[PDB]
């Protein structure tokens, strides 16, 4: 009921797709950042929302800026998020799998940089 994911200096996540076993009550994403660039220039986060909500989350996050991890505080569209990390840093986020609803399309993404993928219940 966890996955390890990396974001590198070339703005790439090392997976495009996360699958969550339906046996899981909670799920944990462990984000890391191979490379050499720091948080203020090549910081990554990992953010989960519906596909429909992603644009507003990113836009509002960029308006909130760097010290708010490029996320709007208390954004109710964000189902789960890590903090922003630079190279060498790590952050894990855990969420309740029952927040993922049948029939919905979930996406994971970084807010400052064009990086995204799918999250699906197995
Ligand atoms: Cu990123």
UniProtKB/Swiss-Prot annotation:
Q: What is this protein called?
A: Azurin
Task: List, for all copies, the residue spans of the domain called Plastocyanin-like.
Answer: 1-122
A single GO molecular-function term is:
copper ion binding
Please name the source species: Pseudomonas aeruginosa (strain ATCC 15692 / DSM 22644 / CIP 104116 / JCM 14847 / LMG 12228 / 1C / PRS 101 / PAO1)
Q: Where in the cell is it found?
A: Periplasm
CDD domains cross-referenced by the UniProt entry: Azurin
Which Pfam families does the UniProt record give? Copper-bind
Extract one GO cellular component term from the record.
Answer: plasma membrane
InterPro entries linked to this entry: Azurin, BlueCu_1, BlueCu_1_BS, Cu-binding_ET, Cupredoxin
Disulfides per UniProt = 1-24
Q: Where does Cu cation bind?
A: 44, 110, 113, 115
PANTHER family according to UniProt: AURACYANIN-B, OUTER MEMBRANE PROTEIN H.8
Give a short account of what the protein does.
Answer: Transfers electrons from cytochrome c551 to cytochrome oxidase.
> Could you tell me the keywords of this UniProt record?
Copper, Disulfide bond, Electron transport, Metal-binding, Periplasm, Signal, Transport
């Amino acid at each position: 009921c966890s996955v390890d994911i990396q974001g590198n200096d070339q703005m790439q996540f090392n997976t495009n797709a996360i699958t969550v076993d339906k046996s899981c009550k909670q799920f944990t994403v462990n984000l890391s950042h191979p490379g050499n660039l720091p948080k203020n220039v090549m910081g990554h986060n990992w953010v989960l929302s519906t596909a429909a909500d992603m644009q507003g989350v990113v836009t509002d996050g960029m308006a909130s800026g760097l010290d708010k991890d490029y996320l709007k505080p208390d954004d109710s569209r964000v189902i789960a998020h890590t903090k922003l990390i630079g190279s060498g840093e790590k952050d894990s986020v855990t969420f309740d799998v029952s927040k993922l609803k049948e029939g919905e399309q979930y996406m994971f993404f970084c807010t400052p940089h064009p990086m995204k993928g799918t999250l699906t219940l197995k």
